[PDB]
RNA sequence: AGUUUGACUGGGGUGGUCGCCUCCAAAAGCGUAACGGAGGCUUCUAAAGGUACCCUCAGGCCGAUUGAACCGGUCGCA
């Protein structure tokens, strides 16, 4: 509930002013922050799948699950049964507290960030180091917004404090 | 010493075949031949059985660390 007040009390009263909606339901609202990482190396050494679960739980605070394969590709020794991914889907306040742990301490501990979305307004971040966080083989981060285009998504994105670029 | 030592077959022998399943030949009911054209079987599951409740693939595109694998979105009667 750190950026929650900053969004409803403060950030919302400015988005309607600029884009000029006739209501308050047209303004973008990120609804979840999905985190994921690929463990193709575990196809031959699967002891590093449990360790990923333990690490992917200390960061967000909520338990994660393995992701099972879905294809039959020999070039990755892949048959449709192996656990090769770990995902966590933060939502509501759980992503709100997590977001503040990242904009202030994660980007600061980097050794800023690209500006390119999928086109529907969902910025996704792949950081190649897991020790960028406090609790800690990178991991994907995706903020699924309620926006329509990149224009609406960007305004929600920069208001939070994402370092972005230019 | 008494006997046995298959049949089909564009002559016989050599080769191939011999029971069962699916398609075409088959002429819009059923059936229907060729040493006509194609493939399979001689199993499997203690759940891959029963029921209640629930769910939806393949592929392409855009985004994204190691990346046709993982995640987000969306076009998708399959
Ligand atoms: Mg006699
Ligand atoms: Mg004869
Ligand atoms: Mg008929
Ligand atoms: Mg007839």
From Swiss-Prot:
This is Large ribosomal subunit protein uL5. Part of the 50S ribosomal subunit; part of the 5S rRNA/L5/L18/L25 subcomplex. Contacts the 5S rRNA and the P site tRNA. Forms a bridge to the 30S subunit in the 70S ribosome. Pfam families: Ribosomal_L5, Ribosomal_L5_C. Transmembrane segments: none annotated. One of its GO terms (molecular function) is tRNA binding. GO terms for biological process: translation. This is one of the proteins that bind and probably mediate the attachment of the 5S RNA into the large ribosomal subunit, where it forms part of the central protuberance. In the 70S ribosome it contacts protein S13 of the 30S subunit (bridge B1b), connecting the 2 subunits; this bridge is implicated in subunit movement. Contacts the P site tRNA; the 5S rRNA and some of its associated proteins might help stabilize positioning of ribosome-bound tRNAs. Keywords: Ribonucleoprotein, Ribosomal protein, RNA-binding, rRNA-binding, tRNA-binding. It comes from Porphyromonas gingivalis (strain ATCC 33277 / DSM 20709 / CIP 103683 / JCM 12257 / NCTC 11834 / 2561). The keyword Transcription regulation does not apply. Belongs to the universal ribosomal protein uL5 family. GO terms for cellular component: ribonucleoprotein complex; ribosome.
């Amino acid at each position: 509930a750190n950026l929650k007040k900053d969004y409803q009390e403060r950030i919302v009263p400015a988005l309607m002013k600029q884009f000029g909606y006739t209501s308050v339901m047209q303004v973008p609202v990120l609804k979840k922050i999905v985190i994921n990482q690929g463990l193709g190396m575990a196809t031959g050494d699967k002891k590093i799948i449990d360790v990923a679960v333990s690490e992917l739980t200390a960061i967000t605070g909520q338990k994660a699950v393995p992701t099972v394969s879905k294809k039959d590709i020999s070039n990755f020794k892949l048959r449709k049964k192996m656990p090769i991914g770990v995902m966590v889907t933060l939502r509501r306040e759980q992503m709100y507290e997590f977001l503040e742990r990242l904009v202030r301490i994660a980007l600061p501990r980097i050794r800023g960030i690209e500006s390119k979305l999928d086109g529907r307004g969902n910025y996704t971040l792949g950081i190649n180091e897991q020790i960028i966080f406090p609790e800690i083989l990178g991991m994907n981060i995706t903020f699924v917004t309620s926006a329509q285009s990149d224009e609406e998504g960007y305004a929600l994105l920069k208001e939070f404090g994402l370092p972005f670029k230019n």
